[PDB]
Design a protein around this ligand. Structure first.
Ligand SMILES: Cc1cc2nc3c(=O)[nH]c(=O)nc-3n(C[C@@H](O)[C@H](O)[C@H](O)COP(=O)(O)OP(=O)(O)OC[C@H]3O[C@@H](n4cnc5c(N)ncnc54)[C@H](O)[C@@H]3O)c2cc1C
Ligand SMILES: Cc1cc2nc3c(=O)[nH]c(=O)nc-3n(C[C@@H](O)[C@H](O)[C@H](O)COP(=O)(O)OP(=O)(O)OC[C@H]3O[C@@H](n4cnc5c(N)ncnc54)[C@H](O)[C@@H]3O)c2cc1C
Ligand SMILES: [Ca+2]
Ligand SMILES: [Ca+2]
Ligand SMILES: [Ca+2]
Lengths: 662, 221, 662
C-alpha cells in the first residue's frame, strides 16, 4: 500500500521532478520518497520510448499533453495562443523533440544567485549525461550519467546539405555548438536518444524506474493532481490531491499526503504557481479575487513568465530525397517497414527525430543597422557586452512539422526558429480554488516591440539557407508570409516537372495553373562545365525585400508565432523585495526555498529569473541535480552521499567494452 | 490507380458512371435585390441603372457547384472537395489584342483588360459572399480551404474555417500522427453547428452553421 | 570549435589519408591532428557500409565520386575517357569493389627506394589487417589489424564453377594468390568486408571514427577542398581551403589552417599534383601558362601517370542460377528480401560484392609467340626475369556490372579484366589557379603499342573460361567485340528455350528472329552415359580466330577500355634529376618528402614510381602505414610509440573467443 506519510515529497514527475525524486531516493535508502504525478505512468510505453512518432503528442486530442488557453492578444493580431505542456510521467522528456542543447556560460551567471554560476554548476551538467559521440572537449561533458545522448540510429541527408549552405552565409561549422561559449555557429544536432537501444532518453526511465526496480524506498503515485500545499506552524507539512479525472461528481474524493523532512514542487512553469497560489502564496488582492485566503505576501508568484518564441517555415524537397512525411501521414507500408527495421536491430527512421542540423546566430553590425531602432537599442543593452549569447536559433527538420491534413501531398523540410532571450514578459494566475479550473493566462508573446526584428531577420536568413540546399525544390505558399502577389520576394512553388513527379503518371491536374493559386520556381543557373563535377552548382536567386514585404513577414510572425514549450520564470529566484530582472518580487532564495515558509523548495523551470540560450531539457536536468543537492545538504548529508548515483548498467564505447552498439 | 480502374471499367461495361459526367451538377443565375444594390459600390449602382435595370432578363452573376476541386491537386491538401465556380456575365471592362510581327508563330501583344473598369468589382465580391452562404447551408459542407480563400484578417469573424478535429482524423486515417496538430496556427477549425430540433420529424431536422458578417477590412480582402 | 592551428595536417581523407591521420593521432595524444576532406563525412552511412549496393557510386550523378574528363585519344578511337575517383570521407575505400589483392614482392623492390623493399614493408602489410579466413601461411598475414578482410556472408555459386573451368586451362588453384610470390593461379577472392558485422571495411571507420570516439586530439574537417599549400621560409606552414560547393559567388570564402610540425598531402593520384602545382611546385613554363608563380622547379609533378587498364565482358547465365541483376535493376520485392535478411542477422546477398573468384596469369612461351612482336620484346625486357609478376588479371562477377538500362533483361555474369603493368604513360596539369577548375588530363590509356596484345589475349582466355562454366548460357552480342557477322568466332546468344524461359509464359516475341540481330548458341556435346553422373559434362566448342576477328577485339579494347581506378605515379619517389623509371624527374625522396621544401610529405598512390600487380587498396593502406611511421620517426618517436595502435575491440575467431561470428 502507498504510505500516507513520507520523508520527502516531490510534486510533479516531469523533466526536473523525476530527476529530483530519483536522486533523493538514492541519497539514503532509509528515506521514504513519494513522487506525485497528474499524468499516466510511462513505464515501458512504446508511445513514449520510440523517438520517431513524437509529433502525435501535439495532436489536440492527445492524452499526453494539456492545452492551456490564453487571453486574446493584439500583438498576435487577436490570437488566443494555445500553450501545450506535458501530461504524463517524465513530463516534457517523455514527449519532446529530443533536441540536445546547452545554454551559454553567462546565462546562469546572470541568474545573479549564489551557487548558480556556471563554474558552480558545471560538474552537475556533466553528472547527468553519457555523451555517446566523438568529443574534442571531454572536460565539459559527462560519460557516466544515466541520461544517454547521441545522434540516434538514422541521419536524414539534410544534415551536411544544411551545413554547406549555412557555411556559405558566414555561419561556421563547429564540432560542438554546446560548449557554453559559442554564440554564432552551425552543427550536427544531438538528440536525447540512447543509440545503444534506439530509445528516447527520459527522466522517468533514467532516474525513477531504474531506482524502483532495484530499491524499495521510492513510491510512485500517478494519475493524481496536486491541489494545494498545507502549512502547519510555518512548515510545509502536507499536500492535498484530487484525481486527475473527476469521475464521481456525486461524491468527489481527495487524499492528503504528509512530508516529514521536505517538499519539492516541480509541476512546471505553468502549473507550479497555480499550486502556490491555491496554497495562499501570492498577491493578496488577486488571491482574494480568486476565492483563496492569503497566507504569504508574494506578488512574484505567476509573474515574470518567459519563453522562447518559435515559428515554422516549410519547404518543398526534390522527389528523390527523404523525409518522414509519408510515415507521419499514416502510410501503412512505410510505417510497417520503419517499425520492422527497429524491431530487427533498433535502427532506421524510428530511431531519430529528423532534426539533424541547426544554428545559433548573432547579427553582424551591418545587419543590426537594418533592423528596428528599438531592437538596436535592446542589443546594446542586453547582447553587446555578452558575446556568448545567441540572438536566434534555427534548425532543419526532415519533414513537415504540423498538420498534414492542411498541407498538400508530397515531401518537405521545415525550418524551425526561435527567439533566445525575448524582452516580452507575461503572467499567469488561478481563477478559482478549483484545481481543475483553467487559469487566467497571458503568455505575453511579442508584446515588447524589441522582439519583432530578430524574428524577421531569422526568417530571411533561414530562407536563404533553404534556397542554397540541394534538397530545395520550392516554397509552400500557404505556409509562408503573405507577400504582395507580384512581389519578387513572393513564395515560389515547385515547378511543372516536379509537380508531375509528385502527382504521379496518372494525374490529371498537376500543373493546371488556372486559378493562379501559386507561382512556379524558375530554373536555377547552369553548372559551370569548366569545373570538376563535384564542385558544380545550380543557384537560385537571392531575395530582395521592400517595406511591403517586411510588413508581410511581421504579420506572419504575429499570426504564427507559438510557445516553444520552454516556459520559465513564474517562481523566480531573487531578492523578495525585487530586482532589476525580477521586478515583481522574488519567489525563492538562492537555495530555492519559497519565502515565508519552511521545508518547501521549487525545482523546475519556473525557477529561472532570466532566460537561457537553449532548448530547456538540459536546464531542467541541471535544476534537478542542483535542487537534489540543495535538499541533501539541508538534511545534513555531505561528500559521497551527495553523489546520489542511480542504478545503471554502463556500456561505455564499443572498442573499450564490446557491449555498446558498434 | 484503383479508382481510375473502376471508373473506366464501368464506362467500358455500359457507358455509365463518373466518367460520363462533368461533375458540374447545379448552378445559378442571379440579379441583386434593390437592398443588395444599395450596399455595393456607387460605380456599379450607376452601371446597373445604365445596363441592367431596363433589361430584366439579363443575369449579373453566374455560379455553379463542381463535385471536386478544379485546379492543381499538388497545391491543395489531400481529401475531397467541392468548388464554387463563378463568373461575371456582362463586364464593362474592355481589352485589345494585336500582332507583334508578321511571324505567324509570334506571340501577340495582349491586354485582356480583366477588371480594368471599376464597375466590375462589386458583383464579384457580392457573388463570393452569396456562394459561400450557399456552401455553408449544404449537407456536403465540412469546412473552408483557407489557402484558397480571401486573406481575411487572422482574427476576423469572417475568416475561413477549416474542417474540425474529427473530420481531419477521418481524412488522415487511423495511422496518422499529425492530424489535429495545431501548433503553427496555420488554420482555425469550424465550430459545431446548431443542434437538431428533436420535436421535429427526422427528415425536417437541420444543423446550421452561422451567417457571416463582413466589415470593410474583410471586403478589402 | 575547430582550431586554426594543428601540429599535424593531413590533406585528403581517402584510403591512405584516413589511415595516416588515424595512426598519427595515436602516435601521441598531445599532438593536435587535423584531417581535411572535400567530400562528405561517411560516419555510419548505410550507403557506404552496406557492401551489396556498391555499383551506384559510379552512376554519373553520384554524390560520392568526381568524374574527371580527359582529352580525346586516337588510341581509344577518339574517345575522351572519363576517369572517376572518390569524393567522400574514406576515399576509394568507401565506394570500391571490395576486392582484396596484394602485389608481388618484386613490385615494391622495384621502387628502387631505401626502406620501401618488401622485406622492410612486410610487417606493415600485416599490421593493417585482421585476416578472417583459413590460413595456411599465417607468417605473411595479420590477425589483429583494424581492417577486417573476409569472404563476406554470402557466396554466389560462380565461385567453384569458375575454378573448375580455369583449372582445365592450366591455371592452378591456390589457397592464397596473395602470397607475394604467385603470378599464375586462381583463387576464391577475398573481400574488404568484416564478416562479423557484414559491413564494408573502410579507412575512415577503421582509423578515424574509432579514434575520435575514444580520444580528443583528432579533428575532422569535411566538405572542404584544399586549394594550395603555403610556404614560409622554405617550410610548408599553412593550407588555403575553399568550400567544396561555391554557394555564394557574390562574396567567396576561404579558410587558412596552419601546421606546426607536419603536413601530409593525400588527395590521391589525380588531385595531389593539382594541389602541388597550385602551390608553385612543377614545370615553371607550364605553371606560368596556368597563371601560377613558380616556387620549386619540379617537372615530375603530374608526370608518370599510371593505371591499370580494364574492360568488362558480360555473359548470359542459365535461368536457374543466381546473380545480383534484379537487385541492381531495382526490383522492389527482391530488394526488400535482401535487406530484410541483412537486418535480421547480417547475412545474404547484401553482405558480398559478388566477385567470388579470379585469376593472375602469365603467357606460356607458345602463347607469347602468337602475340605482337612489340609485346614479345616488352615481355623480355620487363617480365622474363621477374617470375613473380602477373601480366593480366581477370575475375568473375555474379551479375552485369554496367548500366542495366542498356542491356536486355535477364541474368548475367561478367568477366572483369585489367592489365597489371602497362607500358603506357600519361600526365595531368592544372589549367588555372582556380581550385575548382578541370585539369588538362591525358591518362595515356593504350598509347604504347606493347599494351594491346595482353588485353586481346585475356579476352580470349576469359571467354574460354566462361564457355566451360555450368552457369554459361550465351554471349551478349552488343557488349562483345564486333566480329564479322558470319565469323565462327562471333558472339552467340542464348538459345530459343532459354529465351522463352526468361521471356516468361506470356511473352509474344521471344525467339522472334526476324531482323537477324543475334545468332543462337548451338546445343553442347552429349553427356557420356558410360560415366558416373557426377563426372558427366556438356561441352561447347573451342573458338578459332583469324586476323579479322583479332582486329575486332583490338577495336573492342580501344573502345571499351577504362580506368580501373588504380591511378598512381604523379608524385613519384625517385632521384630529383630523374631515373630510368622516373624519366621526367622525381618528386619525393625515399622518406616521401617533397623536394625543395621542408615539412611536407605526400602519402597516397601518387607516390609509386612503378606499378603494382594488384587492386590498390592494400597499396594505399601500406603507403599509409609507412608514411605514418616516417612522420613519427622524423618527429623523434621510436619503439612502441611507432605502433600507433588505434582503438578496436578484437573478436578473434569463434572457437577461441565465442564473440566472432560462427
Ligand atoms: C512537445 C515538446 C517538445 C519539446 N522539445 C524539446 C527539445 O527538443 N529539447 C529540449 O531540450 N526541450 C524541449 N521541450 C521542453 C522541455 O525540455 C521542458 O522545458 C521541460 O520538460 C520542463 O521541465 P519541468 O520544468 O520539470 O516541467 P515538465 O512539464 O517537464 O514537468 C512538470 C510535470 O508535472 C506534472 N504536473 C503539472 N501540474 C501538476 C499538478 N497540479 N499535479 C500533479 N502533477 C502535475 C506534469 O504532468 C509534468 O509531468 C519540449 C517540450 C514539449 C512539451
Ligand atoms: C569505384 C572504385 C572501385 C575500386 N575497386 C577497388 C577494389 O575492389 N580493390 C582495391 O584494392 N582498390 C579498388 N579501387 C582503388 C582504390 O583502392 C584506390 O586506389 C584508393 O582509394 C587510392 O587511395 P588514395 O591514394 O588515398 O586516394 P583516394 O581517392 O582513396 O583518396 C583521396 C581523397 O582525397 C580527397 N580529395 C581529393 N582532392 C581533394 C582536394 N582538392 N581537397 C580536399 N580533399 C581532396 C578525396 O575526396 C578522397 O577522399 C577502386 C576505386 C574506385 C574509385
Ligand atoms: Ca545590461
Ligand atoms: Ca442602356
Ligand atoms: Ca628490365
Amino acid at each position: 500500500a502507498i504510505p500516507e506519510e513520507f520523508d520527502i515529497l516531490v510534486l510533479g514527475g516531469g523533466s526536473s521532478g523525476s530527476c529530483i525524486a530519483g536522486r533523493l531516493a538514492n541519497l539514503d535508502h532509509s528515506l521514504k520518497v513519494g513522487l506525485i504525478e497528474a499524468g499516466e505512468n510511462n513505464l515501458n510505453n512504446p508511445w513514449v520510448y520510440l523517438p520517431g512518432i513524437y509529433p502525435r503528442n501535439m495532436k489536440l486530442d492527445s492524452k499526453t499533453a494539456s492545452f492551456y488557453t490564453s487571453n486574446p492578444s493584439p500583438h498576435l493580431n487577436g490570437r488566443r495562443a494555445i500553450v501545450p505542456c506535458a501530461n504524463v510521467l517524465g513530463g516534457g522528456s517523455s514527449i519532446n523533440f529530443m533536441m540536445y542543447t546547452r545554454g551559454s556560460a553567462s546565462d546562469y551567471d546572470d541568474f545573479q544567485a549564489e551557487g548558480w554560476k556556471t563554474k558552480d554548476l558545471l560538474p552537475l551538467m556533466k553528472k547527468t549525461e553519457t555523451y555517446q559521440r566523438a568529443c574534442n572537449n571531454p572536460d565539459i561533458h559527462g560519460f557516466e550519467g544515466p541520461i544517454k545522448v547521441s545522434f540516434g540510429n538514422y541521419t536524414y541527408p539534410v544534415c551536411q546539405d544544411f551545413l554547406r549552405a549555412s557555411e556559405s552565409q558566414g555561419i561556421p561549422y563547429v564540432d560542438d555548438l554546446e560548449d557554453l561559449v559559442t554564440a554564432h555557429g552551425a552543427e550536427h544536432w544531438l538528440k536525447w536518444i540512447n543509440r545503444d537501444t534506439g530509445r528516447r532518453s527520459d527522466s522517468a526511465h533514467a532516474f525513477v524506474h531504474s531506482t524502483m526496480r532495484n530499491h524499495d524506498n521510492l513510491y510512485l503515485i500517478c494519475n493524481t493532481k496536486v491541489d494545494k500545499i498545507i502549512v502547519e506552524d510555518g512548515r510545509a507539512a502536507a499536500v492535498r490531491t484530487v484525481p486527475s479525472k473527476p469521475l464521481n461528481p456525486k461524491k468527489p474524493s481527495h487524499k492528503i499526503y504528509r512530508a516529514r523532512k521536505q517538499i519539492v514542487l516541480s509541476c512546471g512553469t505553468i502549473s507550479s504557481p497555480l499550486v502556490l497560489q491555491r496554497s495562499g502564496f501570492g498577491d493578496p488582492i488577486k488571491l482574494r479575487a480568486a476565492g483563496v485566503k492569503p497566507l504569504v505576501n508574494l506578488p512574484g508568484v505567476g509573474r515574470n513568465f518567459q519563453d522562447h518564441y518559435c515559428f515554422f517555415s516549410p519547404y518543398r524537397i526534390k522527389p528523390q530525397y527523404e523525409s518522414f512525411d509519408d510515415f507521419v501521414r499514416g502510410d501503412a507500408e512505410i510505417q510497417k517497414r520503419v517499425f520492422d527495421q527497429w524491431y530487427a536491430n533498433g535502427t532506421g527512421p524510428l530511431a531519430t527525430n529528423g532534426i539533424e542540423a541547426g544554428v545559433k546566430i548573432r547579427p553582424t553590425p551591418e545587419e543590426l543597422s537594418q533592423m528596428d531602432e528599438s531592437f538596436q537599442e535592446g542589443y546594446r543593452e542586453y547582447f553587446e557586452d555578452k558575446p556568448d549569447k545567441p540572438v536566434m536559433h534555427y534548425s532543419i527538420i526532415a519533414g513537415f512539422f504540423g498538420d498534414h491534413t492542411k498541407i498538400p501531398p508530397g515531401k518537405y523540410m521545415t525550418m524551425f526558429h526561435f527567439l533566445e532571450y525575448p524582452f516580452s514578459r507575461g503572467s499567469i494566475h488561478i481563477t478559482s480554488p478549483d484545481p481543475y479550473a483553467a487559469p487566467d493566462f497571458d503568455p505575453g508573446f511579442m508584446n515588447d516591440e524589441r522582439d519583432m526584428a530578430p524574428m524577421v531577420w531569422a526568417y530571411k536568413k533561414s530562407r536563404e539557407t533553404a534556397r542554397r540546399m540541394d534538397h530545395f525544390a520550392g516554397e509552400v505558399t500557404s505556409h509562408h508570409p503573405l507577400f504582395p502577389y507580384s512581389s519578387e520576394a513572393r513564395a515560389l512553388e515547385m515547378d511543372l516537372e516536379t509537380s508531375n513527379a509528385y502527382g504521379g503518371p496518372l494525374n490529371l491536374s498537376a500543373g493546371l495553373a488556372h486559378g493562379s493559386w501559386t507561382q512556379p520556381l524558375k530554373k536555377p543557373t547552369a553548372k559551370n562545365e569548366g569545373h570538376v563535377t563535384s564542385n558544380q552548382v545550380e543557384l537560385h536567386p537571392d531575395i530582395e525585400y521592400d517595406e511591403e514585404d517586411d510588413k508581410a513577414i511581421e504579420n506572419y510572425i504575429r499570426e504564427h508565432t507559438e510557445t516553444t514549450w520552454h516556459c520559465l520564470g513564474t517562481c523566480s529566484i531573487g531578492p523578495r523585495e525585487g530586482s532589476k530582472i525580477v521586478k515583481w518580487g522574488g519567489v525563492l532564495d538562492h537555495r530555492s526555498n519559497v519565502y515565508g515558509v519552511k521545508g518547501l523548495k521549487v525545482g523546475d523551470l519556473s525557477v529561472c529569473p532570466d532566460n537561457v540560450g537553449c532548448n530547456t531539457y538540459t536546464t531542467a536536468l541541471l535544476i534537478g541535480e542542483k535542487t537534489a543537492t540543495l535538499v541533501g545538504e539541508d538534511l545534513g548529508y555531505s561528500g559521497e552521499a551527495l553523489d546520489m548515483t542511480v542504478p545503471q548498467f554502463k556500456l561505455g564505447t564499443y572498442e573499450k567494452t564490446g557491449l555498446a552498439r558498434f
